Amino acid sequence: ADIQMTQSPSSLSASVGDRVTITCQASQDIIKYLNWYQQTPGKAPKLLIYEASNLQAGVPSRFSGSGSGTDYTFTISSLQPEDIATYYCQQYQSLPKTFGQGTKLQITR
Numbered sequence: 262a263d264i265q266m267t268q269s270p271s272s273l274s275a276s277v278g279d280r281v282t283i284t285c286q287a288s289q290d291i292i293k294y295l296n297w298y299q300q301t302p303g304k305a306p307k308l309l310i311y312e313a314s315n316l317q318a319g320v321p322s323r324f325s326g327s328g329s330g331t332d333y334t335f336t337i338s339s340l341q342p343e344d345i346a347t348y349y350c351q352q353y354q355s356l357p358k359t360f361g362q363g364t365k366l367q368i369t370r
Contacts, residue, residue, distance in 0.1 A: 264288050264352055268361030275340050276369040283335040283348055285361045290330050291354035297326050297335045299346045300363075309348075310335065342368055 265288035275281050287295070293313035300306040308317050310326035313333055323338045337344055349363035 263357065264291065264355055264359050266350060266352060266359055266361040268350055268364060270364060271362065272365035272367070274367040274369045277340055277342060279340045281337045281340055281366065283350075283364045285333055285335075285350040287331055287333070287352055287354075291352045293329060293333075294354040295326075295328060295333050295350055295352050297324075297348065297350050299344075299348055301346050337366075340368070 268285040295313045297310035298306040350361040
């Protein structure tokens, strides 16, 4: 009964300026009721993209989200060092909310 979110990739590394992409697929239609969170180990999770594609205030325009129906995409256009975090997606089309496994993003040396 609980919707399952498959998030890819599990972890990825890139260097500064690079374009990065994260996708998650819902186990059924969630009608763009999907958010993208940034998380740092010590702090509370920051909401970056609301309702699949609406970017939240105080978040760089580098970040964006697209998707519809089943498939949803998150995109950091230009990677900067402030962006080291775990990124993860949550659906709220049917409660309880189910998150994705999360993407551990790093900066390559």
